[PDB]
Amino acid sequence: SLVNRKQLEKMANVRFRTQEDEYVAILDALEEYHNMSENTVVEKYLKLKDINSLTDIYIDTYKKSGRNKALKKFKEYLVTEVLELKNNNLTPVEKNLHFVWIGGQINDTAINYINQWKDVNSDYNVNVFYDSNAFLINTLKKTVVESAINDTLESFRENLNDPRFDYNKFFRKRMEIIYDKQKNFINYYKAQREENPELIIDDIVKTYLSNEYSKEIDELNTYIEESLNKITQNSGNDVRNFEEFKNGESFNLYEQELVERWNLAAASDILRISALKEIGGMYLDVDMLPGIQPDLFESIEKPSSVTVDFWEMTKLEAIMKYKEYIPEYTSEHFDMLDEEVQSSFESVLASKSDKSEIFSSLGDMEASPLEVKIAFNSKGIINQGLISVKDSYCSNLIVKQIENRYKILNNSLNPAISEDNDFNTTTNTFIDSIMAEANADNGRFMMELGKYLRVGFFPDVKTTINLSGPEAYAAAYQDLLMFKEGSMNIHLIEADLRNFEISKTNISQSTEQEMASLWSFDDARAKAQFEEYKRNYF
Numbered sequence: 085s086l087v088n089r090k091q092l093e094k095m096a097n098v099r100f101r102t103q104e105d106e107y108v109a110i111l112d113a114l115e116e117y118h119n120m121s122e123n124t125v126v127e128k129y130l131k132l133k134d135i136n137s138l139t140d141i142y143i144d145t146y147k148k149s150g151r152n153k154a155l156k157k158f159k160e161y162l163v164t165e166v167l168e169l170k171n172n173n174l175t176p177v178e179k180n181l182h183f184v185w186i187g188g189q190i191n192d193t194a195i196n197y198i199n200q201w202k203d204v205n206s207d208y209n210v211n212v213f214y215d216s217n218a219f220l221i222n223t224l225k226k227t228v229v230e231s232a233i234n235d236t237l238e239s240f241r242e243n244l245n246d247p248r249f250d251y252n253k254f255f256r257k258r259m260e261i262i263y264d265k266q267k268n269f270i271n272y273y274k275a276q277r278e279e280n281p282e283l284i285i286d287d288i289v290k291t292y293l294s295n296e297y298s299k300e301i302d303e304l305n306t307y308i309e310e311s312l313n314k315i316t317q318n319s320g321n322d323v324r325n326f327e328e329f330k331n332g333e334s335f336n337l338y339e340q341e342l343v344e345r346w347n348l349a350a351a352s353d354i355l356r357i358s359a360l361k362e363i364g365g366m367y368l369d370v371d372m373l374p375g376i377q378p379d380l381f382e383s384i385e386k387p388s389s390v391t392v393d394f395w396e397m398t399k400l401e402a403i404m405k406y407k408e409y410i411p412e413y414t415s416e417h418f419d420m421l422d423e424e425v426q427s428s429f430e431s432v433l434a435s436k437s438d439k440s441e442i443f444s445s446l447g448d449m450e451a452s453p454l455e456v457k458i459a460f461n462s463k464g465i466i467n468q469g470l471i472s473v474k475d476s477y478c479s480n481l482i483v484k485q486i487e488n489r490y491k492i493l494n495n496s497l498n499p500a501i502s503e504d505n506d507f508n509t510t511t512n513t514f515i516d517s518i519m520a521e522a523n524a525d526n527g528r529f530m531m532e533l534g535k536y537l538r539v540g541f542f543p544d545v546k547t548t549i550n551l552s553g554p555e556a557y558a559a560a561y562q563d564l565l566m567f568k569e570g571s572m573n574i575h576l577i578e579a580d581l582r583n584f585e586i587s588k589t590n591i592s593q594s595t596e597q598e599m600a601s602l603w604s605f606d607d608a609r610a611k612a613q614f615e616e617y618k619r620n621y622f
């Protein structure tokens with residue numbers, strides 16, 4: 085239990101000192117808190133936050149007071165009480181599974197993974213959010229990028245052995261022309277939406293592709309038709325009917341990533357947490373699979389010669405090898421096992437008859453109305469999996485985190501692009517404003533924001549992480565545990581964040597597709613990629 089009024093008066097007692105107005109404010113607030121056993125969890129949290137805020141104002145008011153030590157310990161006590169509130173007051177999690185595939189056609193292996201979730205979760209409603217107006221964004225990005233690569237490679241022309249025409253110069257010029265093409269497109273798009281507001285993204289993109297890159301409108305209509313057909317046959321849920329999202333203050337951010345930057349990952353980041361906040365349930369990336377039944381392989385000890393991750397991949401590859409639920413799944417790891425272990429897998433799996441003996445079911449999940457739960461990998465939290473009751477407190481904190489970081493980004497970015505200038509001068513105005521607005525609390529973050537316009541077209545850019553990805557989740561967690569909003573500099577350690585992990589049993593993250601998805605544009609692959617562009621062009 086949290087300390088009561090008398091107990092804090094004893095902790096925070098200083099002889100011959102009268103009780104100040106602020107102090108009485110703290111003690112009254114604590115007394116009121118212990119009289120809310122019949123209030124909602126959120127209400128109790130808010131009272132704990134009002135308490136913490138009052139305690140801070142007292143500490144700031146009487147800086148060298150003798151009560152500050154006890155009151156600081158009381159702050160710690162408040163954080164612990166919040167953890168107890170989150171842990172001892174659970175609610176049902178709405179039985180929804182949320183996936184996102186936007187900007188193009190969904191491939192067969194994604195639908196195979198989703199189908200696994202469907203098969204062992206018949207009681208859960210499944211949403212695969214898509215954007216029916218924007219099936220061509222990825223196509224636009226691919227063709228603009230390919231055109232930039234050709235322009236740059238021609239730009240090198242004869243001097244290929246000139247050492248100062250290296251991959252760095254290649255990517256700096258390629259970025260320049262990509263930026264020109266991108267702002268050309270954004271201008272045409274805003275012109276069209278002014279001239280004919282009836283038009284949707286794909287009309288504008290299709291006629292743009294026809295005019296500027298000689299693509300065939302008929303082929304693009306076929307591509308749209310087939311993509312729409314495939315996703316609607318697989319639980320498609322159109323984001324253009326997501327009214328709460330369309331009318332909220334994150335929709336313009338979603339469309340910024342979608343149509344201005346062509347970053348389908350950033351847009352999926354924006355959307356998944358709004359979906360979660362409005363509907364509740366569990367969000368998954370399409371390369372995640374259901375958790376394996378815990379006892380399924382209890383009889384097979386993991387050798388010491390293989391890492392934990394190796395063994396996880398092995399389990400899945402065995403299941404797919406002898407049950408064939410997903411065709412063409414890899415066996416790279418399973419095949420490296422000694423013959424005896426291989427047969428242990430084969431026999432355990434021949435023992436089992438129905439997929440429900442291999443994959444577990446989510447069932448009836450419950451969570452705190454304060455929290456959203458996130459997955460973990462060896463590098464920390466990752467939002468490939470999230471669990472939340474509808475309108476949870478943390479889902480609001482995460483939405484606010486993302487909207488505020490975009491506020492900071494766009495406050496400096498929008499003035500620079502408003503002047504029609506090239507990539508380099510635009511970057512200079514933009515970065516100048518960033519550094520002007522930097523301070524100790526947001527320094528690291530701003531250094532990341534600096535690379536915004538290069539996201540997706542340059543090696544070693546980590547802006548999305550800081551803008552819409554895991555950093556905003558960690559920032560929201562800190563907001564909760566600090567009784568504030570707007571954290572920019574994360575000091576929570578892994579033990580703090582573990583208070584929000586999804587049980588390992590609810591997701592299989594070690595899949596073939598996700599190890600594929602784990603590649604980074606690391607500036608060695610940039611070198612290699614340059615080498616197969618000049619090898620593929622000459």
Ligand SMILES: [Mn+2]
Pocket residue numbers: 369371468598601602
């Ligand atoms: Mn992934």
